Amino acid sequence: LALSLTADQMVSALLDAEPPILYSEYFSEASMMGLLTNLADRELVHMINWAKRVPGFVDLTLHDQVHLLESAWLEILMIGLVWRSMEHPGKLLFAPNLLLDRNQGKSVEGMVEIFDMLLATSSRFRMMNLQGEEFVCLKSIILLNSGVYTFTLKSLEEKDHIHRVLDKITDTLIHLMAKAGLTLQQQHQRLAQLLLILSHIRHMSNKGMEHLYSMLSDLLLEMLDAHRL
Amino acid sequence: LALSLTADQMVSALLDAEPPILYSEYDSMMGLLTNLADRELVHMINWAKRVPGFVDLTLHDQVHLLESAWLEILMIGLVWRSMEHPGKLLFAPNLLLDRNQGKSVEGMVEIFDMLLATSSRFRMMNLQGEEFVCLKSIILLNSGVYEEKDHIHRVLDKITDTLIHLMAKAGLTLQQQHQRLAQLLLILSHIRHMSNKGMEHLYSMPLSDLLLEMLDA
């Protein structure tokens, strides 16, 4: 199924799978982390629904689906954020009613360095004029890639399938860039520039997790392990 | 001004700049590993000066990039020379360690397993030497970037051009070329991850000044 999709059909499925932009509740420095936490927790629900619609993801065992989301969920939140913030220089659009600047990040101990890395990524996307079709491909790469090196004959089968699906998303990115008129050299170069940004998003996720710990497996299984009823 | 080399000249320069394999100074694991890494750093600086385009950056930026990249560079080198040693990491020719030795150091075995998994990934893609040296140069120029930045990106673009060249020269289709390029660059996010976890581990147990002093030999 997923391996038979054309590039156009991959783009469409990913665009359709997109989760909604959530809001914060209808503010002060003291309630800031509570609001961000509440937002991230509501976004996780929609993240599971989205991941189940990424072609190939539901072909995996539930254990492997849990592993991939457990590895990727914060990178996925962050790339969503930097995407939402791209048109808001110097600000992070956590939600439409929760647009924060650097100074508001100061107030939470540990956060401004991460806030600064997020802002620079959003500036980098803005410089590259990142398109929504490219965004959804990158977010799907993160889902399938971040946990794939921390996993039997079934496991061997699973990893091959993941890499085949990753290869299809690469084909899709290149097709988008060719459709946009880029020369072949420019296509390869832009693919590389986008994927190297994924290393920076990994970096920010690890710094973020350290920060979050200074202040999940079963929960993901519960949401992922639905009945058929 | 390194933007003028051809792909073959870029490969040849990278291959010729490769550092030597050092031995473990002995004749206490973490002390040995610490001693080795500190001696390898010197040779890493000499290597970096030969990466085309690097020296065209200010010293401040040269230092900044090395400070951000050095553990990732040590790790990918470790993974590369451990390929032919399944289940073991060849820290040095006289310092070949397996998991249970890694387990002896509280907080190491998880990253030890990640390193082992990376070397198995390299062995299973049949990573080539010309590819490896391109990947290390990318780590150097990319890890700390987030006119000077323009230049860094413009060298990074030159390395992507070179990778595609090597793959085309191997007979890969255009589709296979961009597929493998992507697989290689996604491995760099796992190398970043292992460096992040390694730094947390090492620190649970300034550098710029030391790097400056190394650039004076």
Ligand SMILES: O=C(c1ccc(OCCN2CCCCC2)cc1)c1c(-c2ccc(O)cc2)sc2cc(O)ccc12
């Ligand atoms: O503030 C958060 C955040 C807060 C709490 C989180 O975890 C809450 C615990 N919960 C456990 C179950 C899984 C979901 C998270 C995660 C992110 C967000 C981010 C962050 C930024 C800097 C930093 O140092 C740390 C985090 S990035 C982000 C993007 C969002 O869409 C929502 C919240 C956020």
Ligand SMILES: O=C(c1ccc(OCCN2CCCCC2)cc1)c1c(-c2ccc(O)cc2)sc2cc(O)ccc12
């Ligand atoms: O064990 C080390 C190691 C030990 C000490 C180090 O740093 C010592 C501090 N030193 C201060 C001056 C700057 C250079 C670092 C670095 C790596 C190596 C590694 C490691 C693996 C797992 C893990 O959890 C932590 C580290 S990987 C590696 C590759 C090498 O070529 C050499 C040492 C190593």
